[PDB]
Amino acid sequence: VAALVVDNGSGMCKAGFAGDDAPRAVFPSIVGRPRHKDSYVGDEAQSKRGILTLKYPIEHGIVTNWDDMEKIWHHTFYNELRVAPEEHPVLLTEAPLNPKANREKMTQIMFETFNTPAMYVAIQAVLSLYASGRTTGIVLDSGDGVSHTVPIYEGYALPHAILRLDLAGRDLTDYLMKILTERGYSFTTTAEREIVRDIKEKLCYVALDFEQEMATAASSSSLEKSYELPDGQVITIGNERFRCPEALFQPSFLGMEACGIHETTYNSIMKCAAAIRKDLYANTVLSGGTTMYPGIADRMQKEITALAPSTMKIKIIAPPERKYSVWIGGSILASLSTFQQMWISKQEYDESGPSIVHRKC
Amino acid sequence: AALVVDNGSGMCKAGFAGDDAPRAVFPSIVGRPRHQGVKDSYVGDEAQSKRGILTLKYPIEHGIVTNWDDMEKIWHHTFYNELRVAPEEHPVLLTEAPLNPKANREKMTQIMFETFNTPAMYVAIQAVLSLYASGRTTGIVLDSGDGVSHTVPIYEGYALPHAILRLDLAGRDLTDYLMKILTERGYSFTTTAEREIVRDIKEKLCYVALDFEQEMATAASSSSLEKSYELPDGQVITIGNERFRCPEALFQPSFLGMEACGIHETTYNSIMKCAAAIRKDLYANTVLSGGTTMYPGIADRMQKEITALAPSTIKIIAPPERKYSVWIGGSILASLSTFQQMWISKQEYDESGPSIVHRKC
Amino acid sequence: AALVVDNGSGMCKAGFAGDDAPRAVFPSIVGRPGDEAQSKRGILYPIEHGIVTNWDDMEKIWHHTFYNELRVAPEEHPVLLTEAPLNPKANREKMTQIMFETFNTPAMYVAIQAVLSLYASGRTTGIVLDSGDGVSHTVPIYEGYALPHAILRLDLAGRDLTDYLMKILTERGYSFTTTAEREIVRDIKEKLCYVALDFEQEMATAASSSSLEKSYELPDGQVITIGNERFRCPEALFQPSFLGMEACGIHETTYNSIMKCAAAIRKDLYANTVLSGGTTMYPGIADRMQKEITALAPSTMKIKIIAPPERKYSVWIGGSILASLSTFQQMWISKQEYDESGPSIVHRKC
Amino acid sequence: RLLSEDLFKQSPKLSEQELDELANNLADYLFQAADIDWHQVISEKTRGLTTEEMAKSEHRYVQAFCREILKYPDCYKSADVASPESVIDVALKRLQTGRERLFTTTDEKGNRELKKGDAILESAINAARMAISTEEKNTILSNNVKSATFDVFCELPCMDGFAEQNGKTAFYALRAGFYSAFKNTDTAKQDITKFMKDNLQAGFSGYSYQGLTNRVAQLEAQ
Amino acid sequence: RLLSEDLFKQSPKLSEQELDELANNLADYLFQAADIDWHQVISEKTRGLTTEEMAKSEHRYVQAFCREILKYPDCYKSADVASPESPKSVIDVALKRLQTGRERLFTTTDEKGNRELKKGDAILESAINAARMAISTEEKNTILSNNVKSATFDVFCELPCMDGFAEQNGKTAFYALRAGFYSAFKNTDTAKQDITKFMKDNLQAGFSGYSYQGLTNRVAQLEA
Numbered sequence A: 001v002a003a004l005v006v007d008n009g010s011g012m013c014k015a016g017f018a019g020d021d022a023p024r025a026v027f028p029s030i031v032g033r034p035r036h037k038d039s040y041v042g043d044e045a046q047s048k049r050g051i052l053t054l055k056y057p058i059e060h061g062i063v064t065n066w067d068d069m070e071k072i073w074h075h076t077f078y079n080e081l082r083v084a085p086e087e088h089p090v091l092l093t094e095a096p097l098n099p100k101a102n103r104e105k106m107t108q109i110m111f112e113t114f115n116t117p118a119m120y121v122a123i124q125a126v127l128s129l130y131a132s133g134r135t136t137g138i139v140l141d142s143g144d145g146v147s148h149t150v151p152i153y154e155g156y157a158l159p160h161a162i163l164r165l166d167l168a169g170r171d172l173t174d175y176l177m178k179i180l181t182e183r184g185y186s187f188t189t190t191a192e193r194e195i196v197r198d199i200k201e202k203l204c205y206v207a208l209d210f211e212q213e214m215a216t217a218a219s220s221s222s223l224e225k226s227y228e229l230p231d232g233q234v235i236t237i238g239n240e241r242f243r244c245p246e247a248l249f250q251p252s253f254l255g256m257e258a259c260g261i262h263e264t265t266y267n268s269i270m271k272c273a274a275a276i277r278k279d280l281y282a283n284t285v286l287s288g289g290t291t292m293y294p295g296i297a298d299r300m301q302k303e304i305t306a307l308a309p310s311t312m313k314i315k316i317i318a319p320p321e322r323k324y325s326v327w328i329g330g331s332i333l334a335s336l337s338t339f340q341q342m343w344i345s346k347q348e349y350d351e352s353g354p355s356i357v358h359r360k361c
Numbered sequence B: 001a002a003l004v005v006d007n008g009s010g011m012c013k014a015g016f017a018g019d020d021a022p023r024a025v026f027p028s029i030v031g032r033p034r035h036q037g038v039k040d041s042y043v044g045d046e047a048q049s050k051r052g053i054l055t056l057k058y059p060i061e062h063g064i065v066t067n068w069d070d071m072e073k074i075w076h077h078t079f080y081n082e083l084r085v086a087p088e089e090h091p092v093l094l095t096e097a098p099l100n101p102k103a104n105r106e107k108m109t110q111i112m113f114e115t116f117n118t119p120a121m122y123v124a125i126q127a128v129l130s131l132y133a134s135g136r137t138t139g140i141v142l143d144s145g146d147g148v149s150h151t152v153p154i155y156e157g158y159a160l161p162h163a164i165l166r167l168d169l170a171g172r173d174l175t176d177y178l179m180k181i182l183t184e185r186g187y188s189f190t191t192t193a194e195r196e197i198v199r200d201i202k203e204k205l206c207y208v209a210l211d212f213e214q215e216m217a218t219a220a221s222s223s224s225l226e227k228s229y230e231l232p233d234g235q236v237i238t239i240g241n242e243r244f245r246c247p248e249a250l251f252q253p254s255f256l257g258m259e260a261c262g263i264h265e266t267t268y269n270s271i272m273k274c275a276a277a278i279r280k281d282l283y284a285n286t287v288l289s290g291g292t293t294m295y296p297g298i299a300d301r302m303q304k305e306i307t308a309l310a311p312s313t314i315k316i317i318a319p320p321e322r323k324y325s326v327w328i329g330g331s332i333l334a335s336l337s338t339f340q341q342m343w344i345s346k347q348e349y350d351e352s353g354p355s356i357v358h359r360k361c
Numbered sequence C: 001a002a003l004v005v006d007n008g009s010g011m012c013k014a015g016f017a018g019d020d021a022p023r024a025v026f027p028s029i030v031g032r033p034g035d036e037a038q039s040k041r042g043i044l045y046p047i048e049h050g051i052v053t054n055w056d057d058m059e060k061i062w063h064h065t066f067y068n069e070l071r072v073a074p075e076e077h078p079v080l081l082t083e084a085p086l087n088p089k090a091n092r093e094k095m096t097q098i099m100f101e102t103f104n105t106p107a108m109y110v111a112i113q114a115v116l117s118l119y120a121s122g123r124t125t126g127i128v129l130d131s132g133d134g135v136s137h138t139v140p141i142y143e144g145y146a147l148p149h150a151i152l153r154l155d156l157a158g159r160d161l162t163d164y165l166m167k168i169l170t171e172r173g174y175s176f177t178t179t180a181e182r183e184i185v186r187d188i189k190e191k192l193c194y195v196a197l198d199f200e201q202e203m204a205t206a207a208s209s210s211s212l213e214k215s216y217e218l219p220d221g222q223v224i225t226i227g228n229e230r231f232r233c234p235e236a237l238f239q240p241s242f243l244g245m246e247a248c249g250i251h252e253t254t255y256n257s258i259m260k261c262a263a264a265i266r267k268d269l270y271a272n273t274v275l276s277g278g279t280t281m282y283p284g285i286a287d288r289m290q291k292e293i294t295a296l297a298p299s300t301m302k303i304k305i306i307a308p309p310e311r312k313y314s315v316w317i318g319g320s321i322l323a324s325l326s327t328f329q330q331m332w333i334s335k336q337e338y339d340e341s342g343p344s345i346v347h348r349k350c
Numbered sequence D: 001r002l003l004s005e006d007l008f009k010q011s012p013k014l015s016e017q018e019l020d021e022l023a024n025n026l027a028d029y030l031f032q033a034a035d036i037d038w039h040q041v042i043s044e045k046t047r048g049l050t051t052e053e054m055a056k057s058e059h060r061y062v063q064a065f066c067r068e069i070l071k072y073p074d075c076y077k078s079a080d081v082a083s084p085e086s087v088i089d090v091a092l093k094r095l096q097t098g099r100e101r102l103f104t105t106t107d108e109k110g111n112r113e114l115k116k117g118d119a120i121l122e123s124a125i126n127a128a129r130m131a132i133s134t135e136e137k138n139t140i141l142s143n144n145v146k147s148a149t150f151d152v153f154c155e156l157p158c159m160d161g162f163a164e165q166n167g168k169t170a171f172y173a174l175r176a177g178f179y180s181a182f183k184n185t186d187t188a189k190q191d192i193t194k195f196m197k198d199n200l201q202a203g204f205s206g207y208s209y210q211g212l213t214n215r216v217a218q219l220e221a222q
Numbered sequence E: 001r002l003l004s005e006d007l008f009k010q011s012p013k014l015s016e017q018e019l020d021e022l023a024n025n026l027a028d029y030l031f032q033a034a035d036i037d038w039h040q041v042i043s044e045k046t047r048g049l050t051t052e053e054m055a056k057s058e059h060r061y062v063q064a065f066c067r068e069i070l071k072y073p074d075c076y077k078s079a080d081v082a083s084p085e086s087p088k089s090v091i092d093v094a095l096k097r098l099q100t101g102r103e104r105l106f107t108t109t110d111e112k113g114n115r116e117l118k119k120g121d122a123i124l125e126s127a128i129n130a131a132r133m134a135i136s137t138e139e140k141n142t143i144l145s146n147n148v149k150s151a152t153f154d155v156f157c158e159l160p161c162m163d164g165f166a167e168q169n170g171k172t173a174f175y176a177l178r179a180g181f182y183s184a185f186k187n188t189d190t191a192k193q194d195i196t197k198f199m200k201d202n203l204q205a206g207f208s209g210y211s212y213q214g215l216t217n218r219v220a221q222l223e224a
Ligand SMILES: Nc1ncnc2c1ncn2[C@@H]1O[C@H](COP(=O)(O)OP(=O)(O)OP(=O)(O)O)[C@@H](O)[C@H]1O
Pocket: A008, A009, A010, A011, A012, A013, A060, A061, A142, A143, A144, A145, A146, A147, A168, A169, A170, A173, A197, A200, A201, A202, A287, A288, A289, A290, A291, A292, A293, A323
């Protein structure tokens, strides 16, 4: 029997089958309910925004409402993938430092509600490393809800060196929504944030030299690009293209006191052993949709070289498919024969219970 | 002396820097004949007198200028007619809304130097002026007028762009809602001549109840809150619960069918996303500003309502002159001797053009 | 009177000789564009790991100490500084150089922190486990003199424990990622943590009842509950692997320092193990140390762990007692002596 | 059938018997779907009570609400130690303060679970919302009963775009008749039921332009 | 006294004398004030022209109109990137965008580097005004006569007495009124007369045959 692979994100959920080079299904992690069907999941919830109140079960990478989470999986299995979970082993994912209770609950649901023959929970950042074909290296995983810098050593993360940064795609979307009012536009509603998101994903890019791009945008209109809204309207944006993702390197733009992703990566490396630091600098992997900004890789090395020893050779890895590298790593892992002895059988769960996740994973 | 012009979305205030009150207040409207041919345009009170003959248009909508022809006309009217002064003999301190589009700041500067050829001019955020009027340079200001309500935190007299948030809910919406809930009682106010009466009912009889539910129960059970008002033709109306129901829409925007939160929440939301180091100074300096904040017993409900949504461990400043505190702030500022250098001279504009405003202001 | 300045890797502790308490305690950090610098760190660690890394910062700290906290003229008071065990000669010299060429001290002395802590207990011989914020030390001492060949430094102290507690609280669901939320977790640590005598048995107890659980109310009015986190946190002192370190616990580090001494004096060190530093304040830490060192020592050996109730400031108290002696006023380093002998004199007078 | 956008069109067709049930179904729907400040009523109905007394309150909706709150000790239990300087009053505030905060609950069997602040409030409200027998609902809502039930009534498919279709003058006239129906609070259900029966029988022609024009055209011929 | 916002309330209180005089004044006003639907005219007179061809046309009122629209690139230029939903002439889009974003700000950069923001309506109004100032009087008259039926109705709805008529009485009643108004133009020769009669009859009833209250009362009276 073929194994399933489900990567649950704060904003988007990617599901498919192990062996495939990509997920077969990709939809927002949202649940809409009316004001007493009783629930809607996926794009269907967004199309019916007017009737429903939409909410996110995963927030900042952590599950916050298991009633809604249980529905996302029910939708993932029967609607999106169209399969029976009781005849498919499921490989799920989770964020670093995931609360133990959520580890248990994720297991409890898979066996009691869906009756999976077996399952496994992998760290997302660790899967991203597999997809890049490595066992050692540091992974910057930046999605919609949260950004993590996770150092890995021979397939194992280093819990003490992991740093969490609550600065991800959503914050950038909101930042773009706000700076666009400098040109005279008005994007405030929760429906408009979804519109401005698509503007961000398609027109934003990281500037290698920020102020040399500001001077350029000031001395010319060569950088200005146009976007047609869903209502047929059209808007042009200039420096807002690269000013938005700049918040990653300068959270002060969002009135945020946190450090930049460049410095957060450095700090994370500077919490490991002095010896291994080298392998990390040479294997800095970028994961998640919020690392898809053009020029982000060619910006990162410049930012960390100023922080790193000049003698050490730094190499940044930005796979062209780094938007699904987490799921891909899951596909690779769940397909290996040498991994088949690492699943959590129904037997092991019946014996030990939900707490089994802590020793197996 | 200098000229101080505070342009609002429904009222324009104007006068000389030094006076403790504007010599000229009038509606920010421009009237033009309903039809082609049966002067070409009117401004201010005159446009309102000839309401039947004219179609009225507001050049400032939600605090932002949307028509610069009509805006020029208001200023032209303000100078040559309302104040009877030559603008080329007086520096001009203007005022703008927070998060004012950048082009509007340039066009405002362009007009003052090219059209009226002023010796100099300055642009200040309205909320920041309200702050100065309170003899301060630090804190948060709630400026709710006719077209829009804002919440701006301030440090050393400098606004906090990232921290500022707005709300499309103000005195105009209240007047309209009051009309609605008065029809719910059993009347028919709809004409523009009836609107200005409901507006007066609002500015004279409305107040904010410290507990809405308790006030309503008293209104239904008792008749102690009823109050009689003489309609212009002599007819009497005994408005009751509508007195506090109307200003309630402020705290519960849902009364008007809006998803946004009230002002008590907007203030809390605005403060928290600032630097933690000064949040207790902001709480200790929460100023009320604008005509919509003139309801009696409103400052008590702010004090009351925040304590619920605040650390359980806050002086709210509601000066009695907070209807013109934006202008009064401008009068102080434009008269200070330690400010005469902050002005934008003719030369400074003739060299750098309108784009200079971004640095000086 | 004479000034006493205990320079900690987390907390500087100033005061006057004769008193039984510092009267001044503030974080040793300097921000750029004390406690005031910490509260405003969002808009803006010289003695990390116990040793001075930046001297400009230290000058600011020492400058801050005299005129603001103590409010005294450093030209009118002799200064007793404390020093980390195994402090390099260069640092000792520069410390003396600054005190004269900047503050014009009438005289100054540099005592070792662990030595003062021991002296406060009325002992000249014994071994001191000094555990602070940045670094922990085991310092064997014989008749007033520390024994460098037997001193062992361990980069594991209260700071590492705060971080560890902050981390395991996330297992329970809570979230302390913010910098401001750190000072809360530190307080929780100092109020609710304790050392388990038998760890495995305590985990078993914590997993079978809520008898060990305690509740803590946050500043925002919220309430969090912790169970086995109470003792798993300080347990990192005895098992640094919890923090992802290859080091060995304070119990083995103490033992190793004893075995690095001549066999003749070991019995005295075993019979006079003194605990020092804020990190040794955890309840049930002495009984544990007694248990663990007995488990390592020879069967016949006599063990006694001394845990002074005042051991949070035993370094400073020691310095206060030493700087108040009438027979100590002759062992100072006067101005003239530095002016002619140079910084190197410190090695011969201290 | 209640959520039929053309309810007013087919409602006059059905018999006197089916109208009696349609009017009652529509009536009960308004009271059940009507909204009220739950934080106020649960606080008033359990003030001064102990957590044991809350789990066995006379009001079933009060039990349902509280049962969902008590699952999470952190939201109400008082701390042994405090940061330097009724129970549901604490609970409701902690669930509002810790809006994004996670609370732990342990099942009867060892199983744990983490819920967000509002997810517990929403769950408690839903629990309560599915417990009242409408009469108790009417009693607690007695003050805003005509406003609340009307808000529900407007959202029905049959009322969508009524004011734009018939004008605001007609819409506010329908509101007046809706409010006017409520004489006493002891007969609120029967009252609004009769109002809905009389109007459903007429298909609300007495508030539509088409209906009124047909009425004058029907009247003049006599 | 045509512009009395409460005309329909006060007109029924008048004698048959001033009613007819009032109806004559109103009727004369509608025809004298009748203008043209610039949307369809400009859309048709530019249909199939590029932005360059719109400034080389024979008509001048169109060139003056377009000169105001082309200042704001966002109201007509095609976007580089488009949302996943954009199934979409040159003016037909301009007029639609200026109406879709009537309260949204468009940007224009003057011949010299200066910038300006203007709402859709102001732009759309500024273009119409430029057209009225650049059009020939006879050229206006010819196009007017083609459909004075709607033009006179537009003027009528634009009067204070008709401010938010549909808003207060509903679209179902608004169209009923428009149907009668149009029905009066059944004859070209007696058009000005048939409408004057239409106005007088309704002014007497205060248009109670089209308003909710007017109908409510009428029923209550016919019930007797
Ligand atoms: N091409 C792109 N360029 C820039 N940003 C993108 C692109 N594609 C997606 N994103 C952003 O990535 C985010 C979603 O990416 P991803 O699925 O990796 O995160 P997630 O797993 O849903 O959230 P998280 O993992 O942080 O809980 C969205 O906020 C989106 O705006």
